[PDB]
Design a protein around this ligand. Structure first.
Ligand code: HGQ
Length: 287
């Protein structure tokens, strides 16, 4: 309103409405996120994210706290990965572009993780793409700052430790989510499309096997673990993500280990043999 020349809804988001807007002073187009309620503890923490700049992170340009309302101003990108995968469904996203995107996303996570910032809620809708071949992660650091959010809150990319009620997060949660997204780019079908917490957890178990103390020391002491969970056998990744090659299947394995401590780091993933032949292709992007 006061500081924007024109504002347009472009979707519901995790914390509130997201608008495409034009800054009145500069004329630039930005993404403006209204945070649905302001807690003073959240304003300082999120303001720190204004300094957290990388080519694969959506730039937080401004934090605007006026009229007892909170807005986040981000750099605008024209499409998200959810929409791009839908648009790409007949053909699939080409493998070199999948590889480019995964490599770039890992660079963004490695950067944020090195600065002790987690995402905690990665999903295709928060991965934004441009016509230049870049992909960028939006909303790093918001989940820690804002806590429990006030439409459905997709569970499909949630790591098993959070589904088992651990109220501790680590960098591994983001690697899990990215592994799920990698698999979805390859197969054209969400890996674990749960529509409740237990369905989500059981979809994971039916593919990866029910975890136990051998593969995941400590699991049976997780808050929401039940000894009565069914015991499913683990499937080979060759059945789960064909026609991904053995480098891709080996990297995905390491991103989807049950024990968060065993999951590959973003920095180590960048060195995986899967990326030996990575390139940066131009996407077929219809805006
Ligand atoms: O977390 C796991 C479980 C098995 Br079995 C193999 C690899 N990773």
């Amino acid at each position: 309103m006061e500081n924007f020349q024109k504002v347009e809804k472009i979707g519901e988001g995790t914390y509130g409405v997201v608008y495409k807007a034009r800054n009145k002073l500069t004329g630039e187009v930005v993404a403006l996120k209204k945070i649905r309620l302001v807690p003073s503890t959240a304003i300082r923490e999120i303001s720190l994210l204004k300094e957290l700049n990388h080519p694969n992170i959506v730039k937080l340009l401004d934090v605007i706290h006026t009229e007892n309302k909170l807005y986040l101003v981000f750099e605008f990108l024209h499409q998200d990965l959810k929409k791009f995968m839908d648009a790409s469904a007949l053909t699939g996203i080409p493998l070199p572009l999948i590889k480019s995107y995964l490599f770039q996303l890992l660079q963004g996570l490695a950067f944020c993780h090195s600065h002790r910032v987690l995402h905690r809620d990665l999903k295709p809708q928060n991965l934004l793409i441009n016509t230049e071949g870049a992909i960028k992660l939006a909303d790093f650091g918001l989940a820690r700052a804002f806590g429990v959010p006030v439409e459905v809150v997709t569970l499909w990319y949630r790591a098993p430790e959070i589904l088992l009620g651990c109220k501790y997060y680590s960098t591994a949660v983001d690697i899990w989510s990215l592994g799920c997204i990698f698999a979805e780019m390859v197969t054209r079908r969400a890996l674990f499309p749960g529509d409740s917490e237990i369905d989500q957890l059981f979809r994971i178990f039916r593919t990866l096997g029910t975890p136990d103390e051998v593969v995941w020391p400590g699991v049976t002491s997780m808050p929401d673990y039940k000894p009565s969970f069914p015991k499913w056998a683990r499937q080979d990744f060759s059945k789960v993500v064909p026609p991904l090659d053995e480098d891709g299947r080996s990297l995905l394995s390491q991103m989807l280990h049950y024990d968060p401590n065993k999951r590959i780091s973003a920095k180590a993933a960048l060195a995986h043999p899967f990326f030996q032949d990575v390139t940066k292709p131009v996407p077929h992007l219809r805006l």
